Design a binder for this molecule. Structure first.
Ligand SMILES: Nc1ncnc2c1ncn2[C@@H]1O[C@H](COP(=O)(O)OP(=O)(O)O)[C@@H](O)[C@H]1O
Ligand SMILES: Nc1ncnc2c1ncn2[C@@H]1O[C@H](COP(=O)(O)OP(=O)(O)O)[C@@H](O)[C@H]1O
Ligand SMILES: [Mg+2]
Ligand SMILES: [Zn+2]
Lengths: 255, 261
């Protein structure tokens, strides 16, 4: 059993590429932000980077963002940008490369669902004139970065419900197969009924969710920071609301 | 104002390709099923076809499915299958195009498609307008302007839009409906999903507040689209919607409004 908190990612300075994965709408984006916001507080600079074809960085922050970096309003520290790149994975490689050797200390990546993330990792192994070798070279480098776990982890976002956790599983697992590190799970949108209330629906639900959770724990307790975040009444938008949510990431809502 | 039900899709016999779209996890797959289930009840046969680079038909029905058609357990009528297909997007759509052509020539009377994210269906459209060996660019040519014919024909093809009350989802439904407009393709239904109506008689801050927050959205959807979209409302159930059994039930509401006071 480890802290149910991301404190550890705060602590691990080595980190250069933090990847947030999970299933469509489990709340990936929302975290990516929260996480950045939180790192942004304790790093020199943090670049938040969306690849998802539909970008919601902007929407999340209420702020037009481009393939051009820029300061996030209400910060001096944190930057965000939204771009889009057999062979789609090649344009992606290029971005990381150039970015990687940018003057940003840590990057939190947002992207197209476990799906693309997946195919891409697989790739290198796929390939198994001198520009042939030139490409090879760089991929190879990039891949190593990936396996180096001082430089790269994944956070797993998910909510309690069959189809999401089933990804988080496979995902964690391929991450294992490809020799890439990952030790956090943001289980999100938990419903805790407000104490003192009897309310069929909330009770019943906390029941149904609870069930999943317990599992998650039992499975992963010992090796994953398993973070628990409350499902808020309102969407999580605005620097303001996001800062707040992001707190919990770091110190457990425990009501 | 039209009925808040998909009765119209049951009624519209000409339909051949029903596409269910919306944002990741708003409940696309679940409807696709429910919708097929219900059509299945009043068509000769229905093919439920997934492209999501995912395997969620199976998971939804608890049943291994493949690029090979097959009978859905507990039905004699309904079939489901799951596959995955110098430019980029180009190779890709080529693929998809070929699927449909392929599949349009089976007996199945009506097909309900499940698929890869607005991004992907979107690429498809932007693409055409845009767009004994080589004698072959001719053949694709042909395949697209027909396929794309059938997209533009509103006797053969609509979209159903799925979504739930929350900023980001509805903002897609909007753009989507809109591009659908721009590309001359029909669409006239909205399954707003996951509504929370508090059980009557219950005072319960959170449920109240939420019904408040969602309600706000809904009222809107209605005002804007009341007059021209069947705006269907579906309750958010305690348990996941899996199993033929559970999906049958759910799907009912698709057709006859959950209306609890
Ligand atoms: N714990 C939560 N409570 C309330 N709203 C949330 C929560 N997590 C996410 N949301 C809202 O629900 C939507 C889903 O979050 P998002 O990060 O966009 O998911 P994804 O990017 O994984 O599809 C967003 O509109 C967000 O504001
Ligand atoms: N209205 C609802 N009530 C209860 N559970 C639902 C409802 N809609 C969807 N679900 C379940 O939520 C999860 C996601 O639904 P899904 O159809 O997979 O979304 P998508 O296909 O858009 O990614 C699945 O558990 C689904 O069965
Ligand atoms: Mg789906
Ligand atoms: Zn309640």
């Amino acid at each position: 059993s480890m802290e149910p908190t991301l404190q550890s990612i705060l602590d691990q300075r080595s980190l250069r590429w933090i990847f947030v994965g999970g299933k469509g709408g489990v709340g990936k984006t929302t975290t990516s932000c929260s996480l950045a916001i939180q790192l942004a507080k304790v790093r020199r600079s943090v670049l938040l980077l969306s690849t998802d074809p539909a970008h919601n960085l902007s929407d999340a922050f209420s702020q037009k963002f481009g393939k051009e970096a820029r300061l996030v309003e209400g910060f001096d520290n944190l930057y965000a940008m939204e771009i889009d790149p057999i062979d789609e994975a090649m344009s992606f490689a290029e971005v990381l490369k150039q970015v990687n050797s940018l003057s940003y200390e840590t990057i939190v990546f947002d992207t197209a669902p476990t799906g693309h993330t997946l195919r891409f990792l697989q790739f290198p192994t796929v390939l198994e004139m001198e520009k042939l070798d030139s490409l090879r070279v760089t991929i190879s480098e990039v891949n190593a970065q990936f396996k180096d776990e001082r430089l790269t982890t994944f956070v797993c976002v998910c909510i309690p419900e069959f189809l999401s956790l089933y990804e988080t599983e496979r995902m964690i697992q391929e991450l294992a197969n490809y020799g890439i590190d990952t030790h956090c799970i943001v289980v999100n949108q938990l419903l805790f009924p407000k104490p003192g209330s009897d309310c069929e629906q909330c009770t019943a639900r906390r029941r149904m969710q609870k069930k999943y959770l317990d599992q998650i724990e039992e499975l992963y307790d010992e090796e994953f920071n398993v973070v628990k975040m409350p499902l808020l009444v309102e969407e999580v938008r605005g620097k303001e609301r996001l800062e707040k949510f992001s707190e919990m990431l770091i110190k457990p809502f425990v009501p």
